[PDB]
Structures are given as C-alpha cells and as structure tokens.
Amino acid sequence: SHRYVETMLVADQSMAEFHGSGLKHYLLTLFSVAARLYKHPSIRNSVSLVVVKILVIHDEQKGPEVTSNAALTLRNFCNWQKQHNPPSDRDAEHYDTAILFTRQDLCGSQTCDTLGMADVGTVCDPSRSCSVIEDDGLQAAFTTAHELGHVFNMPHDDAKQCASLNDSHMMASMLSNLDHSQPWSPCSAYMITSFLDNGHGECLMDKPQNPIQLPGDLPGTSYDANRQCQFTFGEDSKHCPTCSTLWCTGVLVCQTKHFPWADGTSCGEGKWCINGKCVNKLVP
Numbered sequence: 667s668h669r670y671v672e673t674m675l676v677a678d679q680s681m682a683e684f685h686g687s688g689l690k691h692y693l694l695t696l697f698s699v700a701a702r703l704y705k706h707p708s709i710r711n712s713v714s715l716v717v718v719k720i721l722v723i724h725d726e727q728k729g730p731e732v733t734s735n736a737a738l739t740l741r742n743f744c745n746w747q748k749q750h751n752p753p754s755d756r757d758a759e760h761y762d763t764a765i766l767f768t769r770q771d772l773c774g775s776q777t778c779d780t781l782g783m784a785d786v787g788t789v790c791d792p793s794r795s796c797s798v799i800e801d802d803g804l805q806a807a808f809t810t811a812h813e814l815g816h817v818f819n820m821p822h823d824d825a826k827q828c829a830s831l832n833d834s835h836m837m838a839s840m841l842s843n844l845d846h847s848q849p850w851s852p853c854s855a856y857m858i859t860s861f862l863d864n865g866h867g868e869c870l871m872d873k874p875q876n877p878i879q880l881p882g883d884l885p886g887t888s889y890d891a892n893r894q895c896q897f898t899f900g901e902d903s904k905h906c907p908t909c910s911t912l913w914c915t916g917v918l919v920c921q922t923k924h925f926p927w928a929d930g931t932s933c934g935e936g937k938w939c940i941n942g943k944c945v946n947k948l949v950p
C-alpha cells in the first residue's frame with residue numbers, strides 16, 4: 667500500500683542569506699526532483715514525499731548550531747527539530763522526517779568531501795528521523811534522496827549485505843555516475859521493502875492535510891544555466907563562456923563539478939536539456 671513521507675524542510679542562515687526571497691522555491695525545487703526519484707519504478711514501492719512544513723532560520727540562535735563537522739551538525743539538528751514537531755500525526759504540520767539544508771561545506775574526519783548526512787533506519791523515530799544536506803547546487807536533490815535512502819534503511823550498494831543482489835545507483839558509497847534509467851539498485855529496492863514488510867513504515871500511512879504544492883515544471887525551467895552556475899560557484903559566476911557538463915566562470919577561467927545541466931534547461935530556441943542531452947521541447 668501507499669506510503670506518504672511527511673517532511674519538514676529547514677534552511678539555515680547561510681541559505682537565507684545566499685538565496686534571499688527565492689529560498690523556498692529553491693528547496694521545493696530540490697525536493698520535487700527527489701520526490702520524482704522516489705516514484706521511479708526501480709524503488710519497487712509506492713513512496714510519496716510530501717512537504718508539510720518549512721522553517722527558515724534567519725538567526726543562528728533560533729536554529730541548531732551548524733558547523734563544518736557533519737556528524738555534529740546532524741546531531742545538533744536532530745535534537746533541535748524535536749521541539750518543532752507536534753506530538754500526534756493528526757496535526758496537519760506534524761512531520762515524519764526533517765531535512766536541513768546548509769551552504770556550509772560539511773566534512774568527515776578526513777576530508778570535506780561530505781555532501782550530506784543521516785543515520786540508517788530512522789524514518790518513524792521522531793528524534794532520529796533527520797538529514798543534513800550541503801547545498802552546492804541543484805545536484806543536492808540527489809543528495810537529498812540518498813540521505814533519505816539511509817533514513818529508509820538503505821545501506822550503500824557496496825555493503826556486504828548487497829553482494830547477493832547487485833557503484834552506478836543512488837546508494838553508491840561515493841559520488842559516481844548515476845544510471846538515470848535505473849536509479850535504485852536491487853539492494854536498495856530490497857532493503858526498503860524488508861523494512862516496510864517488517865512494519866517500520868507505520869507513521870507513513872496517513873495522508874497529509876493541505877501539503878505545500880511542489881513545482882511540477884522541470885528544474886531547468888525555474889533555473890537557467892547562469893542560475894545553476896551561481897548555485898554552485900557563488901553569485902559572481904555565470905554560465906561558460908552543451909547539457910552534458912555545466913561549465914561556469916571563475917584569460918577566461920572556467921570551472922565545473924562534472925554535473926550535467928538540470929533537466930529542462932534552455933539550450934537554444936525550442937530545445938532543452940534532458941538527461942544530459944539537448945533535445946527539442948516538443949516530443950513525438
């Protein structure tokens with residue numbers, strides 16, 4: 667049966683300052699891509715990510731302490747989100763999960779290549795059902811879905827428990843090329859299924875009361891290549907000077923993080939990017 671992941675989205679002061687008025691549309695744009703990934707048939711389940719609440723923190727002290735140490739930020743965030751959840755799921759703004767988004771670059775013990783953070787198997791535990799996402803651009807939509815994967819009991823696809831069943835899927839242990847034709851591995855598929863068959867989706871059974879509408883356009887529609895570049899490299903960056911790799915300014919100096927342009931991104935009159943390819947908007 668149908669599962670509804672009622673979610674609170676939280677943005678820290680770094681996000682408020684960076685994004686200004688456009689902040690809530692941007693989080694919703696992230697979450698809508700993540701919501702799509704969870705509807706892909708390879709998850710082999712019926713999962714609906716819905717937003718019941720959004721908090722923006724304009725003053726550090728009114729939110730959790732966000733530090734570059736990712737494990738500690740997650741823990742800070744988890745503690746802090748408790749107080750803002752209504753007790754019973756009868757309440758409309760009661761959430762099953764909470765996600766923090768920050769511009770601060772998050773770090774492990776060893777490098778600052780951390781992109782997000784969550785514990786495994788926590789989705790209906792109100793005090794552990796959280797994630798922190800570093801916002802380095804639109805690709806943070808896939809970070810959002812990966813970490814939500816942890817929350818749903820998915821291990822990384824190199825875990826020994828995944829040997830029997832399966833680097834190119836959502837739950838890769840490191841950033842690599844996603845297979846957009848099959849986002850979730852057989853392992854991810856099984857580990858979420860097991861979890862729900864074991865009864866751990868219980869708080870996901872109730873439908874949301876007037877959820878915050880997610881954008882139904884493509885992320886490239888709201889955000890053109892210059893915007894995309896700015897989300898990654900700061901407001902002074904523009905598109906370089908197509909689709910497969912987004913290059914951005916920094917002797918013309920240009921830089922990339924190797925991601926394609928967001929789907930729906932204008933690549934000329936009557937054409938737009940779809941899975942790394944520039945194609946006519948009108949399809950046959």
Ligand SMILES: Cc1noc(C)c1CCC1CCN(S(=O)(=O)C[C@](C)(C[C@H](C)c2ncc(F)cn2)N(O)C=O)CC1
Binds near residue numbers: 783808812838844
């Ligand atoms: C962008 C993007 N575009 O497409 C995709 C796909 C992405 C996301 C790629 C993911 C790579 C791996 N991570 S990561 O590199 O930040 C490492 C780490 C913080 C390790 C921690 C220890 C850890 N936490 C929990 C565990 F269950 C295991 N281990 N992680 O896995 C966090 O979940 C996060 C992001």
Ligand SMILES: [Mg+2]
Binds near residue numbers: 749750
């Ligand atoms: Mg509150």
Ligand SMILES: [Mg+2]
Binds near residue numbers: 846929941
């Ligand atoms: Mg795609």
Ligand code: NA
Binds near residue numbers: 780781
């Ligand atoms: Na980081």
Ligand code: NA
Binds near residue numbers: 771778779
């Ligand atoms: Na970094």
Ligand code: NI
Binds near residue numbers: 682683686687724
């Ligand atoms: Ni503001």
Ligand code: NI
Binds near residue numbers: 690691881
């Ligand atoms: Ni909007």
Ligand code: NI
Binds near residue numbers: 726731
């Ligand atoms: Ni601080």
Ligand code: NI
Binds near residue numbers: 832835848851852
């Ligand atoms: Ni595969």
Ligand code: NI
Binds near residue numbers: 761762871872
């Ligand atoms: Ni619920």
Ligand code: NI
Binds near residue numbers: 901
């Ligand atoms: Ni400015």
Ligand code: NI
Binds near residue numbers: 902
């Ligand atoms: Ni400027």
Ligand code: NI
Binds near residue numbers: 891892905906
């Ligand atoms: Ni351009």
Ligand code: NI
Binds near residue numbers: 922
């Ligand atoms: Ni590089």
Ligand SMILES: [Zn+2]
Binds near residue numbers: 822
């Ligand atoms: Zn992970």
